[PDB]
């Protein structure tokens, strides 16, 4: 687990739909600049994953672990066809980077 390492993980995994370092602009993926502590459905000009929002799920560490293990199996609405996770180790390093920016 590291900080300068996870930075390349998210920046090389979900840095296309979730740009947490662009400019508060969220075109395809929801601006993950503060997903930690914020529930789904928040941006005004963005129909965030309406499903997740209704499920009443709070985006957190372990909570995001499940939704990420399967976004289509967990929330039947997301439009992100993310690939299934195959290395929980790298996932832990992911939350680490987002924890320094959106949780530190
Ligand atoms: C486009 C190719 C995406 C990639 C790659 C990833 N995500 Fe995504 N995500 C995407 C969209 C379009 C949306 C909005 C839902 C919809 O209806 O389209 C999302 C949403 C999420 C959320 C929910 C946040 C919220 O709505 O409040 C999470 C927690 C999320 N995405 C996580 C996530 C992670 C961890 C990714 C890399 C492992 C990832 N996404 C990639 C589009 C795309």
- Token readout for 93 is 């390093």
- Could you list the residues known to form a binding site, using ranges: 14, 17-18, 80
Whole-number Å distance, alpha carbon 78 to ligand 1 midpoint, is 7
Please give the Cα distance from 79 to 104 (Å, whole number): 29
Backbone angles phi, psi at 23, to 5 degrees: 180, 50
Please give the Cα distance from 23 to 31 (Å, whole number): 9
Pocket of ligand 1 (CB under 6 A): 13-14, 16-18, 28-30, 35, 40, 48-49, 52, 59, 64, 67-68, 77-80, 82
Residue 36's domain comprises 1-104
Whole-number Å distance, alpha carbon 59 to ligand 1 midpoint, is 12
Please give the Cα distance from 80 to 102 (Å, whole number): 21
Could you tell me the CATH number of the domain that includes residue 51? 1.10.760.10
How many structural domains are present in the chain? 1
Method by which the model was determined: NMR
């Amino acid at each position: 687990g590291d900080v300068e390492k996870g930075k390349k993980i998210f920046i090389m995994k979900c840095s296309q739909c979730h740009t947490v370092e662009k400019g508060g602009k969220h075109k395809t993926g929801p601006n993950l600049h503060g997903l930690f502590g914020r529930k789904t459905g928040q941006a005004p000009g963005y129909s965030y994953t309406a499903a997740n929002k209704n499920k009443g799920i709070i985006w957190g560490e372990d909570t995001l672990m499940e939704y990420l293990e399967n976004p289509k199996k967990y929330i039947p609405g997301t439009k992100m066809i993310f690939v299934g996770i195959k290395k929980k180790e790298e996932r832990a390093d992911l939350i680490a980077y987002l924890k320094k920016a959106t949780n530190e």
